[PDB]
Amino acid sequence: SKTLKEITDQKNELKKFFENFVLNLEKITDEVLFVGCGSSYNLALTISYYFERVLKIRTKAIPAGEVAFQKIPDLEERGLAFLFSRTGNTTEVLLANDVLKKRNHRTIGITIEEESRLAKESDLPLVFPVREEAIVMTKSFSMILLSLMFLADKIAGNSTERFSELVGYSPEFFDISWKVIEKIDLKEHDHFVFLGMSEFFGVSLESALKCIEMSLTFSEAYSTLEYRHGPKALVKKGTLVFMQKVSGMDEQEKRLRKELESLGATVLEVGEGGDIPVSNDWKSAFLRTVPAQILGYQKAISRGISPDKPPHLEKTVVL
């Protein structure tokens, strides 16, 4: 499977990508927008939290269709907008780019295709040297996220040394993830729930989408503690929860885990002190959709369907 290959590339090629492209990136206002569709909107949401966190600037993540059709509450008088479209030809993103440019916003074109309309129509194209072929986005989410988190810290003057450590940890992280998820009785779980706060909520939204697209399993995401306020009514044997642990909340997380378990759910924690260890600091966001991509893949195999052929999907969505 090409999809399995590209998921696995987060283990095999990440360091190379990090060292050849990310580490060379430093040699890009008041309000900064992050605009995109589907996985790219999830990516925009995740980085918007981090940018506001490390640069202390106002950010907004907006689905591109809302910008394209000017349904968003009015913008500031000027600003900077990061536009995301992996293929670079997503109609809504190109329409958004035009609307933003006509509204005095300078646009940055994030895409992996150098000859795409976004590469050619954005004010500041930023083409990523990443080869990703499959319908479902996998490694491109992590690699673009890693790059923009690293870039934000460099602009802020923050230390980026921990990104080398997390990148170095990706192979072991991947192998632990694969083996831990292999032990789940997949055929018996058909309701996936992804929980996480702030940047980890964005990771959770992206996680649900991977399982929806790859495996056709009803999946949903919530900010961690929000899950008690209604959503848990659906819990029963068959519900699988992937919880993204965050610094300092082990007590609340363990309490929620035991509660969901008593209602029938299978709960898996991602983070130190959980089932799949990884730093609980926000910087680990670029690795945290890996467990859900592996869940999606394994679950599809389990159902006997191909994660490389999701029904009805197209790489470039064109209106």
In the listed set 131, 158, 185, which residue is the last one of a domain according to the structure? 158
Decide: 125 and 94 in contact? Cβ < 8 Å. Answer: no
**Same domain for 128 and 169:** no
**Same domain for 73 and 193:** no
**Same domain for 272 and 229:** yes
In a domain, 316, yes or no: no
Decide: 142 and 286 in contact? Cβ < 8 Å. Answer: yes
Decide: 163 and 284 in contact? Cβ < 8 Å. Answer: no
Question: Distances from the Cα of 176 to the Cαs of 91, 199, 271, 274, in angstroms?
Answer: 39, 22, 12, 12
Decide: 122 and 80 in contact? Cβ < 8 Å. Answer: no
**Same domain for 279 and 205:** yes
**Domain that includes residue 249, residue range:** 159-308
**Residue 221: closest CA among 235, 233, 204:** 204
**Same domain for 127 and 99:** yes
What is the distance between the terminal CA atoms of the chain, rounded to a whole angstrom? 29
Helix/strand/coil for 157: coil
Decide: 33 and 82 in contact? Cβ < 8 Å. Answer: yes
**Same domain for 237 and 174:** yes
* DSSP code, position 184: S
Give 154's contacts (C-beta < 8 A, 6+ positions apart). Answer: 25, 26, 160
**Same domain for 76 and 51:** yes
In a domain, 39, yes or no: yes
In a domain, 116, yes or no: yes
Kind and range of the H or E element at 37?
Answer: none
In a domain, 319, yes or no: no
Give 258's contacts (C-beta < 8 A, 6+ positions apart). Answer: none
In a domain, 313, yes or no: no
In a domain, 298, yes or no: yes
**Rg, C-alpha atoms of the chain:** 19
Give 304's contacts (C-beta < 8 A, 6+ positions apart). Answer: none
Find the CATH number of the domain harbouring 115: 3.40.50.10490
Give φ, ψ of 100 to 5 degrees: -70, -40
In the listed set 127, 158, 189, which residue is the last one of a domain according to the structure? 158
Resolution in A: 1.8
Tokens 């060379």, residue located:
24
**Same domain for 193 and 303:** yes
**Same domain for 170 and 99:** no
**Same domain for 186 and 115:** no
The number of domains in the chain is 2
* DSSP characters over 198-254: THHHHHHHHHHHHHHHHH--EEEEE-GGGGGTTGGGG--TTEEEEEE--TT-HHHHH
Helix/strand/coil for 192: strand
Cα-to-chain-centroid distance, residue 219: 15
Kind and range of the H or E element at 101?
Answer: helix 91-102
**Same domain for 90 and 15:** yes
**Residue 82: closest CA among 135, 130, 46, 134:** 46
In a domain, 318, yes or no: no
Reduce the secondary structure of 47-97 to three states and give it as a string: HHHHHHHHHCCEEEEEEHHHHHCCCCCCCCCCEEEEEECCCCCCHHHHHHH
Reduce the secondary structure of 289-302 to three states and give it as a string: CHHHHHHHHHHHHH
Give φ, ψ of 213 to 5 degrees: -70, -45
In the listed set 109, 125, 158, which residue is the last one of a domain according to the structure? 158
Kind and range of the H or E element at 129?
Answer: none
- Experimental method of this PDB entry: X-ray
**Same domain for 300 and 196:** yes
* DSSP characters over 243-297: EE--TT-HHHHHHHHHHHHHTT-EEEEESTTSSB----SGGGGGTTTHHHHHHHH
Give 19's contacts (C-beta < 8 A, 6+ positions apart). Answer: none
**Residue 62: closest CA among 22, 103, 21:** 103
